[PDB]
Amino acid sequence: NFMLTQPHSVSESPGKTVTISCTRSSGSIASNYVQWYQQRPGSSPTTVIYDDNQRPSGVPNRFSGSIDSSSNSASLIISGLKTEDEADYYCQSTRVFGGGTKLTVLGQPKAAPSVTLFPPSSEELQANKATLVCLISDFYPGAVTVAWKADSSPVKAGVETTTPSKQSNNKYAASSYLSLTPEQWKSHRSYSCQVTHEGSTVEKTVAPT
Template sequence: METLCGIAVFLLCLTGVAPTPVLQQPLSTSVPKGGTAALSCRVEHLNIGDYGGAWYRQRGAQGPEWVLVHWASGSIDRAKGITERYLPSRDTETNSYVLTINSIAEADTGAYYCAVTYNNQLHFGTGVQLLIPSRQLSAPIVHLHPPPADQLTHDNVTLSCLADGFYPGYVRARWTLDDREAESELCASAVEVSQAKDGSYSWSGYLTLPTGQWDAHSRYSCQLQHESSPEPIVSTIEREACELQ
């Protein structure tokens, strides 16, 4: 994957075409009713001071709705019903658009997506869930399990990453092979999420890859991003240690 990215950057330099902007948002943010939320959107490959930043919201099964846009000039256009409780700004140190929402109410909860128009295309962020928490935040306990021994003679093997006991129920997974992100062209992944009676969540992630890829690497990691921790929560296995068991 790093090689492909390097080629892409090289070609962009040759052609003079700027790379596509990337908009990154945290998974979720939990704010008590009546509190204040600051939703951030960090932008790469684009100077936020030169472009207007827009925000969209999606609540439940409804379609996304436009909230507002903060133009490069500093002016603000808001959708009907969006009051000055919704205040956009820019953080130039981190090159981020920020949407601050005051006096949080149930109607404010949902997924918020930042967006920017570049080269006549609208580019969206990954989305952040704004929640009013119903219990205390708790971090996931993560366990990565190697493929069963009888799979090693098959064409493909599957690693299982299991996490439980966390709240809220939003996690983002990253798989690495020898500390490099697994290439989607070689691997297939699947996830399942469920909620326990105590309100906490469980997550199951599965990575299937050719047996040759399992044999070609020695260190495997499942990394989970969650609101409760500023750093990913990681579980790692060593192939040689697994084969000795």
């Protein structure tokens, strides 16, 4: 088959136009149809635009379709409006769904995330365990990409991430944990915790002892 990809997140202050893409892996995007899904958090997904450029009865126009081929992709164009319509999106073509991007309206000004990396404790190595603690606090929007690398390549086995949650000052906080063994902890030279925030990457690196 293939794999449908789209940007992780997007933000925009009310008034202007937002753009969301959905890129085909192999084959022409015009070979099969494309539809998009609207879902607010905690609710059930509902259709917003189906069959290329159409709107089901109930849609308040505004949202427009675009299957412009370009580099074998398909974009979503929405006229200038934010209101309360700002949530995740999905593009589906055939038996495959997109990665998922969310719309974050801009209120308070943005701030850079704070990332702290905690190497596994020495007492943990006694029990043949080694957990890496990466903590993220006071970031906005609550959508970041966190991954672990063994100093020359990303590693996905045993990684854990937490969904950002709303905090007291209208911000978001999260964390991340990676389970490793003491033998693998000292086998590599260093480990890094990479966090990407709206195209800005903040990374912390730790070494044994």
